[PDB]
């Protein structure tokens, strides 16, 4: 679920999902068009694609379980949808951590009109 | 809350 993803993001990065990732660049928190602005935005692009791979799942609300094996996120077995959603979120959280070094506050609340063009998954 |  979105809330679980947000807790995972905070655990991983020490930033609150809202507002650090909820309106960032062209893809973070609100997904659709444009060239991603930076690596963090690309994490969101890929995460959007990952959810897009699951048209008959409901990632905003469906809850999954996961645990930490010293640091590492391990998705626990739920329904097929839950497992796949968890893997998408895990990847994005790791991606955010891997790209914290280039995270830029200037991309928070990034205006829609600067995001133009479709980029294929 | 959030939507990506």
């Amino acid at each position: 679920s979105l809330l679980e993803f947000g807790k995972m993001i905070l655990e991983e990065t020490g930033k609150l999902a809202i507002p650090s990732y909820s309106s960032y660049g062209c893809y973070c928190g609100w997904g659709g068009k444009g060239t991603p602005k930076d690596a963090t935005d690309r994490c969101c692009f890929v995460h959007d694609c990952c959810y897009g791979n699951l048209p008959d799942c409901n990632p905003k609300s469906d809850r999954y379980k996961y645990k930490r094996v010293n640091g590492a996120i391990v998705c626990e077995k739920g329904t097929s949808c839950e497992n796949r959603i968890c893997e998408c979120d895990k990847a994005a959280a790791i991606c955010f951590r891997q790209n914290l070094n280039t995270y830029s506050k200037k991309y928070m609340l990034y205006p829609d009109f600067l995001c133009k063009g479709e980029l294929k998954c | 809350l959030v939507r990506y």
Side-chain angles (χ1 to χ4, degrees):
Chain A
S1 69
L2 191 52
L3 273 182
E4 285 161 358
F5 183 38
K7 168 175 164 269
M8 190 185 284
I9 290 167
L10 174 61
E11 279 171 351
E12 200 74 7
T13 69
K15 295 179 174 288
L16 292 166
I18 304 164
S20 295
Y21 292 101
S22 46
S23 70
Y24 187 103
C26 292
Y27 291 91
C28 288
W30 201 257
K33 60 164 60 185
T35 292
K37 302 312 302 183
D38 68 357
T40 286
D41 205 10
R42 287 192 292 275
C43 297
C44 295
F45 178 85
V46 172
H47 185 249
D48 292 346
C49 293
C50 198
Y51 278 6
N53 296 328
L54 313 173
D56 291 337
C57 301
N58 297 277
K60 303 251 211 48
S61 63
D62 195 358
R63 298 192 192 190
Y64 50 77
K65 296 296 192 176
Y66 71 97
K67 69 189 164 174
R68 298 275 174 172
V69 178
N70 284 58
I73 296 167
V74 179
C75 293
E76 292 170 286
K77 190 171 177 155
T79 65
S80 297
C81 275
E82 286 160 359
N83 300 338
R84 298 160 87 191
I85 293 162
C86 184
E87 291 294 335
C88 290
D89 287 2
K90 169 178 172 181
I94 290 170
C95 185
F96 291 149
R97 181 71 187 84
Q98 189 151 53
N99 292 293
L100 269 182
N101 63 161
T102 59
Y103 177 102
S104 294
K105 287 173 142 51
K106 79 191 162 176
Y107 294 131
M108 295 171 60
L109 301 178
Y110 198 67
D112 183 82
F113 80 105
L114 292 177
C115 297
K116 325 143 244 268
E118 277 122 73
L119 211 154
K120 299 185 174 170
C121 291
Chain B
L1 21 88
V2 228
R3 182 247 181 164
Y4 20 4

